Symmetry: none
Subunit: 124 residues, 4 copies
Amino acid sequence: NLYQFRKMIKCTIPGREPLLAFTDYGCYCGKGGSGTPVDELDRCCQTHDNCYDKAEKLPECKGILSGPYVNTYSYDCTDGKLTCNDQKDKCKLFICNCDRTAAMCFAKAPYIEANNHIDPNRCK
Amino acid sequence: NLYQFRKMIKCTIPGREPLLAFTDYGCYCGKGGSGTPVDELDRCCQTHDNCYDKAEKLPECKGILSGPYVNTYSYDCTDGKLTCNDQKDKCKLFICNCDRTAAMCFAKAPYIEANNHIDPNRCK
Amino acid sequence: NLYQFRKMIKCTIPGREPLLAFTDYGCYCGKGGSGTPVDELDRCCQTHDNCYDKAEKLPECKGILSGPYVNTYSYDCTDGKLTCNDQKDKCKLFICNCDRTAAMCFAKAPYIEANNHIDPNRCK
Amino acid sequence: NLYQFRKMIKCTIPGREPLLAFTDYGCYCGKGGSGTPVDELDRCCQTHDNCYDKAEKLPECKGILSGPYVNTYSYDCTDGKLTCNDQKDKCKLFICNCDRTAAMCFAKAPYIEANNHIDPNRCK
């Protein structure tokens, strides 16, 4: 779920607060999504977006709490390393990976403050 | 003049073709100009656009062939480093300084192939 | 095969010669590997390297010419768009996607001249 | 002094905690020196390392509390801009400039989280 995704970001990016840093970046990094990603970090959030859609369409995701936002999965954060544990619940595993990939991508991507709190027009 | 600017870029970033690499990139590099550069390279050609305006308004730039495109200044390209030799004619000097700064800004800047021939829009 | 990979790169990055631009960049783009990728474009190469290690293990990859270096696959480059066509031969399809993915981000990734023709030590 | 340098960074890049962000980054940021900077940020920390060395040799700096870490200069932070106020004491003024240049460079520079605590290896 989104609470767990925040936690994963806190694992690959220890001192930063996701709700502040990645909450209004580029075109896709937070609030809605339209236009072309201003950079790699934006692409991580874009990939994160459509990785959630795929999950919402995975014939393997059950009901009501099967969504990427509310579906709790099983994961581990050891020494800044994320590992998905779900095994038989192919849907939870999928959602856990969307978050694991995004959290790692965010860590390895260039954070360019010129691309933070952009102007809408840059996203048409 | 334009031929020399090309040479400078060719001096600073040898592994590129100036024409194909810098005249259809972003929203200020080559053609037009308008609305927030998509990246570093883009602002380089924005700075080089402002600089070409100043030059035209420089009192010391008067008469036919004093314009940035056609004005032939004096310069040197040694071991990858640019030097403007104009002292007397402070107009040519100013023009050469625009090109030099630009050619140096270009080399020193991350080039994103995808930023070539962008939409319109991103520049609204 | 590698000849086709080169072509794909010529599709997403026109007028640029892959054998000059991407053959000795970062720690992975070009001969050898080892170390940690200096940037994104380097990772695009690292990813490509391992995507090739995977295909050499894919149980669906047959005989002498099943390897990613010599396995001719089927694709299309129309208007700068890459598409893999194989279906029955899932191996070819896999190899074609390694090349399509890499060629695709080589274009989205920033090319930093400072991370080209690096120093060995910079890769341990 | 170092307290003011901290504040300067706070001035140009408020969304970050100076200590945690700029003291254990790359091959030069904060801890030790050596090797080739992993990136632009690492490289601002290299020139803000050299500059401190200059200041120490600067004949114009003499006596106890003239050193960059402890020398207290006069500066101002207004709407994200920094200006060094020292005129008479050109020792303080030089120390302030090193700080201004770095803190001001820390901002317009891409931050790569993954570059924190790099492998004392790519610093050879």
